[PDB]
From a paper:
SMPD2 was the first mammalian nSMase to be identified and cloned.
Purified hSMPD2 proteins were subjected to cryo-electron microscopy (cryo-EM) study, and we ultimately obtained a 3.07-Å hSMPD2 structure after sample preparation, images collection and data processing. In contrast to previously reported monomeric SMase structures, hSMPD2 adopts a dimeric architecture with rigorous binary symmetry and with four transmembrane helices (TMHs) protruding into the membrane. The dimer interface of hSMPD2 is formed mainly by TMH2 within the TMD and by β6 and α3 within the CAD.
Author numbering:
A (entry chain B), B (entry chain A): 3 to 284, 300 to 401
The structure:
Amino acid sequence: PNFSLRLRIFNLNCWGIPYLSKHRADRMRRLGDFLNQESFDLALLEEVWSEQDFQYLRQKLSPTYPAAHHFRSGIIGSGLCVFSKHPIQELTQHIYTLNGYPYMIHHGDWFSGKAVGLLVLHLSGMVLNAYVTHLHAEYNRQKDIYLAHRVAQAWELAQFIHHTSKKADVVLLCGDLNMHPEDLGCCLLKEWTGLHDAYLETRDFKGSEEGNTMVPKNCYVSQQELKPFPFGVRIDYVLYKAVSGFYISCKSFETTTGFDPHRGTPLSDHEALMATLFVRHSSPLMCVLKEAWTELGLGMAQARWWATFASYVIGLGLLLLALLCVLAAGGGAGEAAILLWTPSVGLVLWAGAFYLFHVQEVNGLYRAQAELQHVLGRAREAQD
Amino acid sequence: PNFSLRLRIFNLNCWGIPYLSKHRADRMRRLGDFLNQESFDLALLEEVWSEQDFQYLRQKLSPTYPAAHHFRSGIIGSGLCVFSKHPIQELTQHIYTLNGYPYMIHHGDWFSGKAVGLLVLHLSGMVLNAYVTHLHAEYNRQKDIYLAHRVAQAWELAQFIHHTSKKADVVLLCGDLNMHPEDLGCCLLKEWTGLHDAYLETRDFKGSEEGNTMVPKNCYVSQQELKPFPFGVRIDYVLYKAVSGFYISCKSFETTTGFDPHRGTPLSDHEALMATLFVRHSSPLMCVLKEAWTELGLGMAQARWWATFASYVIGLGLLLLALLCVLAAGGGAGEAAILLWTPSVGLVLWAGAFYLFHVQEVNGLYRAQAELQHVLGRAREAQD
Ligand SMILES: CCCCCCCCCCCCCC
Ligand SMILES: CCCCCCCCCCCCCC
Ligand SMILES: CCCCCCC
Ligand SMILES: CCCCCCC
Ligand SMILES: [Mg+2]
Ligand SMILES: [Mg+2]
């Protein structure tokens, strides 16, 4: 027969960080009211770190959205809340192996345990796979110590979607990639999976200039962060694809322009993305993959160097400990050898933890690089 | 037309641990010779921690097996080597979130970074998904602090297979589950996925009494470990299932009886599993799931208690540090306040790391429990 489906998709990074976000409770309340009024088919909230906030929203949005799930991983949680007016048939989560560095507390991404969540919804006889994700943040554009990490996360995300979506008719990904469209990670994910950006394909667009999710107008956003880019950055995306026999088109795409759609203070530092999708029945560029392979190799070399440096520190600490024992045994100093001894022990223990973390990082980088190399090799065989 | 496929599957836990395994190099050499002579379609080796050993085997088995992959995760690596006479179309890996405790060095499973690996092989127009896995070990049968961990790992393994095998005609899992057939984890995996044990369904069985992979006869196995069970334990399995339109039967299943099939010293402490599978064209028990849900909840409660205990220790250390400063400021003791100060600082740092690890563990336990609860709830809705 004729199949027509209308999908209302809402994506918002809620910036609900406890004790670090202004007016967090008020923003949650406004968001709940907005969602109830709109009645989106699927709403994919992000950065809701507080469990209480999820429970506040789940109870508030219960009649409109009977199905709600929160993905939890890492110390502070993944932060992914998903609300659906349709019952979720299946749930699964993939957690990225290389989420940053713990010593970089000022950044703090490592404690998040970032992940990608899969929701399977069967709508009108059509399998839909929905993915919500939050990639590692970018702190300095000019120099990135997380460039390799994000590329690996993008590759793991691409692999997860490719493997788990075999039978899904429509594949939807809504997430804060944290990368520009030009950036390698976005290209790698799109080229492999085959997903298409909603903003690029929308018949009608209403909202912030250039669809930029982070905007100077928004009060919460720091001006210094957006000083390089005058109109702000587009780092949140709605990506969609359909199998043969199914055609999906993006009728209307909308953003809220740096403010609450009720003229109130913005809901979050980021910007809401609202996409209307209509579903009607009826080769990866190896250069992109090779560039990713090269970047991962550079990252691995740096990780190996850090592990080697750490091993040297452990050795130095051990030599110092031996020297301290000699001095104590001789008794020539006659004092404070014990005092110096305890910190020296701690140095060795800490340098060992640093070394172990780096060895694990090299293994993590290798896993992504090896899979990329495998794909590249097969492509070369096909070419020849 | 008529489709007939013969599959020769070999599974062996190689026990190739560097500096902890007797005759490791000799055993690797014997294994390479055996594999070359046999020419198994797929060989799924396990516990090969050394990279050099993998390279030794890959070069040796290269003409017979053009395709070989090693999965690497964690500090010491996953240890999964797979050799295939057929080119591997796709590779992906899932690493279990809750692999044990690092403080339990005597056990040492945490450093392994255990994982499940997926190999996609297209054979004669038929998609085959092959999974190799190694679950957490069991140390005391009577009391398990890893009971909850293994159940969570089994659930994550079941979910991974279920989601990634949508399009696969034949699904094969060969791994060291480390659990008896009666145990909950095996039941949970089999009930969800639908996999069938080869030993149970084999037309002909040759080998050790009761198919027990770990045997008293084998010299390497410690007698104390097998003191409770007279004939040994069956903890390695070959599990297989096929989609409708495809029928798979296990013609011959074989084990090597505690020795090298050449009458030499055994290849490993464990036992080789050799299954011949013929493929010819043409509801989960909620009680098992509910039992798993209950066990995870008990584990979570223990983890929460440990985190609370750790927080108390951090507080005590801080109070001690404050007291030490007071004494130093007063100068009444006049000595050794600095000496005592440094260890007290270390206590706080270590108790904090312990606390963070436990908070992460609670989140990990929650992820498995929430998915199980979701499935149980849907089943109840169907029942009513
Ligand atoms: C996300 C994975 C992070 C794990 C970091 C590895 C650190 C190793 C610490 C080992 C502690 C040993 C205590 C006896
Ligand atoms: C497999 C995951 C293991 C991670 C263990 C978490 C330990 C947290 C340690 C934090 C270290 C902070 C250093 C400043
Ligand atoms: C995961 C432990 C890392 C500690 C690094 C201290 C420099
Ligand atoms: C991952 C760090 C755990 C340390 C525990 C020390 C008791
Ligand atoms: Mg943020
Ligand atoms: Mg072993």
